[model samples]
Target: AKIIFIEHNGTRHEVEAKPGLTVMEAARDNGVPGIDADCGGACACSTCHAYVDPAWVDKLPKALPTETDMIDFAYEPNPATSRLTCQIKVTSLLDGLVVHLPEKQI
Candidate 1:
């Protein structure tokens, strides 16, 4: 599957991501920049925050309690779209998933 990461600065990165990889892993491996993932996908740090494209919102799993709580730490998180990339595992259904990075991570 392919994951498209749009940086806050408007740089677009389209990377091939494996089904088992987390969105953060895909971005980090491809050097998409902006996703800090400071807690290394532990769901402890919200640094890997990104906004799931509106059209794909319902396609993604609901954020877990831990992830929702951590979202409070993200910079300017949107209640409707903000998500921890580390919590979003890539799968075939997510091909062409588009995630927009915030202006900055927390």
Candidate 2:
């Protein structure tokens, strides 16, 4: 599926993702700046932090407890919308999904 990532400064990258990978992997693997993905999709760090596009937020499955706690560590967490992209699975159904990067990853 294809996803779009918009950096805080408006840099955008259109990413094509394979199955069995997370949005973090897609962004970081594609050299999409603003995403560090340092934890390697383990949901153990805030380096992969992102804000899901409002329209797509509800479409995504709820985050896991581990993910919730992890994202709380982001530089400027917005509990209502902030998420660890590592928790966002890439699926054919998610083609065209959009996520916004924060000013910085923690």
Candidate 3:
């Protein structure tokens, strides 16, 4: 399993993310605040939007075209490193990855 650190509102939360699980699942299941994941991991909402730490950007998979499109509607537009947590699968290589929650989620 991969370990991920999520920072929101200046607080940090850590969670275990197994392969085949989306970042959204890990966050919600492990009590990481600020991620509603209201639609599960279907990528139906922008509630799971997050900005990946620059140091770990290249460690994740390339975003799907649909994921990129959904991120366009997120509350806080971010850099190229931004991603919808629901679209990111966990992998061993991402063990120490960090993602920061947006200031707002809509």
Candidate 4:
């Protein structure tokens, strides 16, 4: 599957991902900027915060309570769409999903 990540400045990177890989892993593997999964997918850091585009927001799995607790501290979070990329598992259905990176990560 391919997922597109749009940066704050509107730059977008469309990359392929293996099913079951986390969104954060896909971004880091492709060298996308503005994302730093310092806590490694443990849902313990806000560095991987991203805005799942409207079409895919509900398609992503529900964030764990701890992931929700962590994003509360992101530098800039979109209340309705922000999520920890590490919490989103890439799936075949998300072949063309889009996500937006925040201007900064905390």
TM-score of each prediction: 0.97, 0.94, 0.89, 0.96
Model 1, range 1-106, lDDT digits (tens) per residue? 9999998888898999989999999999899889889889999989999999999999999989999999998999999999999999999999999999998887
Reference-based lDDT, each prediction: 0.94, 0.88, 0.81, 0.91
Cα lDDT of model 2 by residue, 46-84, tens digit: 999999989898889998888888877898988778988
> For model 3, where is the 10-residue window of minimal lDDT?
1-10
Q: On TM-score, who's better, 1 or 4?
A: 1
Give per-residue lDDT, candidate 3, residue 8. 58
Better of 2 and 3 by TM-score: 2
Off by over 4 Å in 4: none
- The clash count for each model shown is 0, 0, 0, 0
TM-score, ranked from best to worst: 1, 4, 2, 3
Q: Is candidate 1 or 4 superior in lDDT? A: 1
Instruction: State the RMSD for candidate 4.
Output: 0.8
TM-score of 2: 0.94
List the pairs of residues colliding in candidate 4.
none
**Per-residue alpha-carbon lDDT of model 3 for 38-101, expressed as tens digits?**
7787887888899998988888888888888888888876767789998888877778788888
Q: Which residue window of length 10 is worst by lDDT in model 2? A: 36-45
